[model samples]
Target chain A: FREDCPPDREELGRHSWAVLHTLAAYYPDLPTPEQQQDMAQFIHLFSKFYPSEESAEDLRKRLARNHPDTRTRAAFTQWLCHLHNEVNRKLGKPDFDCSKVDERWRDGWKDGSCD
Target chain B: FREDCPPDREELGRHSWAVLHTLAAYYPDLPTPEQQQDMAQFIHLFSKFYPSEESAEDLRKRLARNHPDTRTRAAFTQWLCHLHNEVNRKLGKPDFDCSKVDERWRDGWKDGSCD
Candidate 1:
């Protein structure tokens, strides 16, 4: 959406949930109810205008520009697990099975995963 | 302070107060009492880790990266004014004496100022 465009709240909610799910995958210790609420609020606030799929890829590339250290990568992976779990739980399903997803699927999922 | 250093709250408070003062100068319409309190809270949160004088200068230079447009500048100026006034009130001063202070003083004031 352009700067002047009003956000579609439903669309925003979906995107926010997607990001949350990704975060859950990285940190599978399920968030408390309070944390879930807080995360929801956080997502609603800024995810309304989250970058497009291409832009998100660019952002990831930029973030990985210097190459995250082992520690940073570990933290990120944990966060992704937590996010994935959150998303899956919201959909009333088991979390994404890593064995079922190929590297390409994971890559595409990061950009925008409706499922 | 380095990344590993713990912040001194008193010192952080002072620096935060100073930034608020600078903000106030740019937007002198006087905030409400509630706003004053809110400004104080805002300053205390991130001021502790605020960069040093040299670093701040570097940041300003970088923030001027593409040269902030008129609209951006106006917003920034207003925010600075608001912040400055907040600091001045905390110091129990009317405000920065813009007339008494030259451009050099103002420039230096941004880096760090006790009074």
Candidate 2:
């Protein structure tokens, strides 16, 4: 278990990305103007405190392809998944299958390991 | 050990706070004008996608006490640590010593547990 302590860069990226993608999964189907604006601005600001130069660059290049300020929750989730995979590819971490986003995040794996 | 998969809410929270504290540890003592603006705005936006109503409420209450965007990194780090301790108290996690933040985060534990 993660006790009370600080995380290094790799741990930070894994967790930050996890929170981000999970949040994106639950965004409204039709978000308010305020929600859209907030999410868009959130990305820009979060990058300012990105844990390190390597992760910062990862976010930059990935954001160029897709950002998380889309209107629909589904689009936001898809956009984030794509971005996450981009980082995975860059880091030589295994690329996740897009189709599995919901199962992996929202519904849990078909294997029921989380249960 | 973590695998290439999505995280649930609690997992998301633990990882998120870890990265946030770590990032705060490394922030510049005298940040640029742009950095100050960005970090201040970053906290605003990161809270938007917080994983749950519970955590969102936690962030709202904590930020009311103190938000980042101070002129100095040490102040920023202390502000965050205090905020973090507030959450820890709410959740019944152990309180971290403010003085040991650098040792816990930057310099590693004195006993060398992290090593």
Candidate 3:
């Protein structure tokens, strides 16, 4: 990638998703109450602070209707996967399989392609 | 880079910094009270949710002593730059000039390297 370039929307979006998904990947399998609250608060603030007005509004609505299940890692991961799929659909992008989220974000592909 | 590979600490750190710096770069010059509160809360939650205990504690302290000035874009940008420089020093990495924060994050270099 062109690391020196000022980030375009696509580049910035990619980076943002990387951080979000990685955060979910590292979430504890059985999160504490404080941890759960913190993650939820992070998402809320993140939506409020998102750069685009329309996208931010959309994010806010999406989360309101389907709040993240921050009690456990698998719950949050699936919640995020569904959210990402909604965005992908809006962009006419292919949908990702939710079952493989850990493989995609936490562990490399079992096929050894990543190695 | 190896996009298919699972993110290592280095890769995750790069993405996290990208999101954080980009958020600061897009901060409004004269933010509303709500906007300022949202940004501050985002940082607080981010510090609490960070995966590593040691690094999270360090982030929590850095933020407490030098809270981000979210009232203006330049203020937040400079605050983050100084914070990043502290981490850079601890890691034996080169410190980034605060004066160049905008160029590095929001705008391409004057040298046209990005173009």
TM-score of chain B of each: 0.29, 0.83, 0.92
Q: What is the lDDT of residue B95 in candidate 2?
A: 92
lDDT ranking from best candidate downward: 3, 2, 1
Name the regions of candidate 1 deviating beyond 4 angstroms: A1-63, A66-115, B1-5, B14-70, B91-94, B98-115
Give the 10-residue window scoring lowest on summed lDDT in candidate 3 chain B: B1-10
- The residue ranges of model 3 lying beyond 4 angstroms of the native Cα positions read none
True contacts kept of 3: 0.76
List model 2 lDDT by residue over B55-93, tens digit each.
787787777776675677898788888888887897799
Point out the higher-scoring one by TM-score: 1 or 2.
2
Instruction: Give the better candidate number (1 or 2) by DockQ.
Output: 2
**TM-score order of candidates, best first?**
3, 2, 1
Instruction: Give the range of the ten consecutive residues with the poorest summed lDDT in model 2 chain A.
Output: A1-10
In order, the Cα lDDT scores of the candidates are 0.37, 0.75, 0.85
Per residue, candidate 3 scores C-alpha lDDT tens digits across B10-98 of: 77778788888988888899989888888988998888777667777988998889887787898899988899999899889999888
